[PDB]
Symmetry: C5
Subunit: 151 residues, 5 copies
């Protein structure tokens, strides 16, 4: 019987930062609403959440990095959609955006929820946008509280 930390989905008093990659506009918009309502449903106050926008997923890294450095946020959320087109640009954007999100969380200690879809079709992104947005709100809240522990 080992000491088992229980997940804490209690947004009360957490400061959450959100960055939305706008490309595939309709997809990003659906994610954000599902994310914000779940944040409020989880206990996050509208006054403790900031939302910013970037043209595309490759620009997420520089934005999320600056917010992590401010240390004003307990956790961050990355939103957006990369939809396969005709070229190897899909694999590049998918790899680099995911790696940057991963790297920021590791070096600054600020959890970053990876809500960036990497899909083949608009239909796949539409089916996942709202659900993944809600999941990203849950991941940010739990991982922010998990970060406060272990400190």
């Amino acid at each position: 019987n080992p000491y088992i930390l229980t997940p804490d989905l209690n947004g009360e008093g957490l400061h959450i930062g959100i960055v939305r990659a706008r490309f595939n506009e309709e997809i990003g918009q659906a994610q954000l609403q599902a994310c914000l309502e779940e944040l409020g449903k989880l206990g996050v106050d509208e006054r403790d959440v900031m939302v910013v926008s970037v043209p595309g997923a490759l620009e997420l890294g520089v934005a999320l990095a600056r917010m992590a450095e401010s240390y004003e946020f307990d956790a961050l959320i990355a939103l957006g959609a990369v939809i396969r087109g005709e070229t190897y640009h899909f694999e590049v954007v998918s790899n680099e955006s995911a790696a940057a999100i991963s790297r920021i969380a590791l070096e600054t200690g600020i959890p970053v929820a990876n809500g960036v879809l990497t899909v083949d079709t608009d239909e796949q992104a539409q089916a996942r946008a709202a659900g993944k947005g809600a999941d990203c709100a849950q991941v940010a809240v739990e991982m922010a509280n998990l970060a406060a522990a272990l400190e």
Copy 2:
């Protein structure tokens, strides 16, 4: 040629566990097999900590904070990445493994990679218990191997 001999001895070691809950049943089977093997090696139930994160992408931040505290001789990563419909499988598989590798290299804390990267739920089920036990065997040996080399 001096040949360091393997040392499989939990014996009072503090081992940290992070479990990605996605594909929950798989993670629980790994954790059950993992703790059982840890005790079989001599790790005290009060000296091993277990933490949970939603998915494999959240392992990096959890394992990282635990490693920096230097409270643990070795770490264990558990969870399962099962191929679905999208390139998300390759992303989660690559980044989760890269973080586990990176935390071990930079911090000196060995991290057993118990994250399955499989194509089907059936493959994860066939391997869950075996890989959980192996991560206990790797975590114990690598914690001890660090001491002979520190």
Copy 3:
């Protein structure tokens, strides 16, 4: 209604650095013309923009890095085209050039627009050159302003 920062596409007073990988020259030149024209439309002064060129995408990293380190530029732009040929060289050039662009922006804090095409055919590069050049101007301007809001 959470505080929602709105995009700022106002180039006025911004200093932009541009690095153009010349291999597949016609594509790089089309991107540069579309990029500069869009920069001016956003309010960037022609006297505040520097343009340098390198033989290929693998040489972008070292040039962009020195420009970022000088901290003379609010944002940087990488232009060029990697077109699949006969060998794994395509995957190597595409991966490493993109990875360096990401790493420079992450570590120095200066946004770098990734305008390097990674395509299979010359026709694909031609169809995308002008749009990607102009898009890189919009990304550089917007992200330079976005960085300023978080700098203090």
Copy 4:
């Protein structure tokens, strides 16, 4: 042109070599190591200057080589083992990460690390390459250890 051309130096005399062996695929690793030590001695390395360690798998090579490199007790390091494709993407994960760690350690500490980890599709391919790969890693470690010493001061 007649530029100065540094010539390879394959004179192990007095070199201290560290070895880390991934035990998974047992027969492959020892066949590599026996071939490796035999070639090291043929190159002039004394048996008293070589240390040998074992790890469960290739993914644990990185942390072990890292502790040895940080000590700066070794002129060059060698990583041995075999990754044989099975049924899952695990083959690519182990192959990529283990090689990347070997690469990163050599760059950051300046201590060359010979990459002796095979990445093959079948046991038969691993067997065909095991013996040659042990010897090749000895020639790489000795030569690259001396090349670091030249470029040193």
Copy 5:
């Protein structure tokens, strides 16, 4: 319109110090590259007394050599030569990826341009067709980029 400052390429090797590392595996290919590379370097004005040439067994060993040479800051630019030719195993992908990543990483961290002259092809026949051209190209890249770094050092 927009007529910004356009720094123009400088292909004048005169007074540049170039370091070269040649991965010997596939000997004939690497040597064909080196001769084409030295011949082009001299054509650009680089003195044979300002060029150093070193050797490594393979591309996986390029990184550690190039890194030590770059740290000395005795060289205005570096060149990596060699060939990785696909065989029977995933070793081709590993060697191609890691050697290229190290070459890229050294240029970023030290500021010393490193020309990637490592071919990554499927057949010896492709390597033969490219050896001389890439050797000459790495001479032009090293010279031009050495001068471009100097223009940005101020």
